Enzyme design. Structure first.
Site, PDB file in Angstrom:
ATOM      1  N   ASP A  81     -31.455  16.919 -15.406  1.00 19.73           N
ATOM      2  CA  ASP A  81     -30.053  16.526 -15.642  1.00 19.73           C
ATOM      3  C   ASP A  81     -29.665  16.852 -17.079  1.00 19.73           C
ATOM      4  OD1 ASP A  81     -27.567  15.448 -15.666  1.00 19.73           O
ATOM      5  OD2 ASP A  81     -28.251  13.337 -15.534  1.00 19.73           O
ATOM      6  N   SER A  91     -14.617  26.800 -22.425  1.00 17.06           N
ATOM      7  CA  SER A  91     -14.345  28.009 -21.639  1.00 17.06           C
ATOM      8  C   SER A  91     -13.035  28.625 -22.106  1.00 17.06           C
ATOM      9  CB  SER A  91     -14.335  27.631 -20.151  1.00 17.06           C
ATOM     10  OG  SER A  91     -13.896  28.679 -19.367  1.00 17.06           O
TER      11      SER A  91
END
Ligand SMILES: CNCc1ccc(C(=O)NC)o1
EC number: 3.4.23.22
Length: 330
Positions: free
Chosen positions: A35, A199
């Site tokens: 994770d 992004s």
């Protein structure tokens, strides 16, 4: 040193991936969810409330000659999906794919929430976010990666998740055979303890690329892609009959649909998520309503590049003094 381990989907939808991890002496092998959105290595154990164990493999510290109680240490964690676990702590020898750390904090669950009990395939979590998020009190503990880092050939790990197929986690090296083209690196903020990046934008199917900054986290422990409501509405508007369902808890679409791809930007590079990656199947057995793999991050407070996005790429988690992320097509 290096390590290399295969990660395997837990079910036919890629709801999560499990990676075998050796704990203790002699080794006890548990299948952990790696994770990158949390920083605790915790396991089902001989201490877990018996009614909360249903088919998991358990760590038994009393059977490990290297296990030591970390005296006074407790842990308690709550995840973004409402699941939780807590317990006490041992140090022990932990190996992943041939890479060994001695004195790793292994957080032994005394309690786990129903979602963990109900998933027999996941024996615990191995956190790979920054150690500043580790929950152990009163002495915070380091992640497996942070403890391994100095010994590694290069201070990196990579995630190469498969679509409906096994993939790989590598520690300490970049397998130049595992991706196509070049790796594009992008800046990371560690201010929230996550692999947080920005992004450069998105496209839906064959549509034009929209240049827009989207701050989010690369999170292997989240199934889906969670993005701002504007972006998600633009994606699902291209699927006849798709809608956001308050009763189901997100966008659903007709199972008869062919989904468009989704592209996200990494600097001047582009990662294309095929449409099939975005299909999470019937909402209930035999339903013709299918659950979408791109969902709104509205209410969550953060955008999450979960497995739907990451499995379309070869992803480098660069733990150099200034951390960075790398993405390649594959
Ligand atoms: C922290 N990364 C694993 C995890 C647990 C729960 C969730 C979640 O709710 N993601 C949207 O992620």
């Amino acid at each position: 040193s290096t390590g290399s381990a295969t990660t395997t989907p837990i079910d036919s939808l890629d709801d999560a991936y499990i990676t075998p991890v050796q704990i203790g002496t002699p080794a006890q092998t548990l299948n952990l969810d790696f994770d990158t959105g949390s920083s605790d290595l915790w396991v089902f154990s001989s201490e877990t409330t018996a009614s909360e164990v249903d088919g998991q493999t358990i760590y038994t510290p009393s059977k490990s000659t290297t296990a030591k109680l970390l005296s006074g240490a407790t842990w308690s964690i709550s995840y973004g999906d409402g699941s939780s676990s807590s317990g006490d702590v041992y140090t022990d020898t932990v190996s992943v794919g041939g890479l060994t750390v001695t004195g790793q904090a292994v957080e032994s669950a005394k309690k786990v929430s129903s979602s963990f009990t109900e998933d027999s395939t996941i024996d615990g979590l191995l956190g790979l976010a920054f150690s500043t998020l580790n929950t152990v009190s009163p002495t915070q503990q380091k992640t497996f990666f942070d403890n391994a880092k100095a010994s590694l050939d290069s201070p990196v790990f990579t995630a190469d998740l498969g679509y409906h197929a096994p993939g790989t986690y590598n520690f300490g090296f970049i397998d130049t055979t595992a991706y196509t083209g070049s790796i594009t690196y992008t800046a990371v903020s560690t201010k929230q303890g996550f692999w947080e990046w920005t992004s450069t934008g998105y496209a839906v199917g064959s549509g034009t690329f929209k240049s827009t900054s989207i701050d989010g986290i690369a999170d292997t422990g989240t199934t889906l892609l969670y993005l701002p409501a504007t972006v998600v509405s633009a994606y699902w508007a291209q699927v006849s009959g798709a809608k956001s369902s308050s009763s189901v808890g997100g966008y659903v679409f007709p199972c008869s649909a062919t989904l468009p791809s989704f592209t996200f930007g990494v600097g001047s590079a582009r990662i294309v998520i095929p449409g099939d990656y975005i299909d999470f199947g019937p909402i209930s057995t035999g339903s013709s309503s299918c659950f979408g793999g791109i969902q709104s991050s509205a209410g969550i407070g953060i955008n999450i590049f979960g497995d739907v996005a990451l499995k379309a790429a070869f992803v480098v988690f660069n733990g150099a003094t200034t951390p960075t992320l790398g993405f390649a097509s594959k």
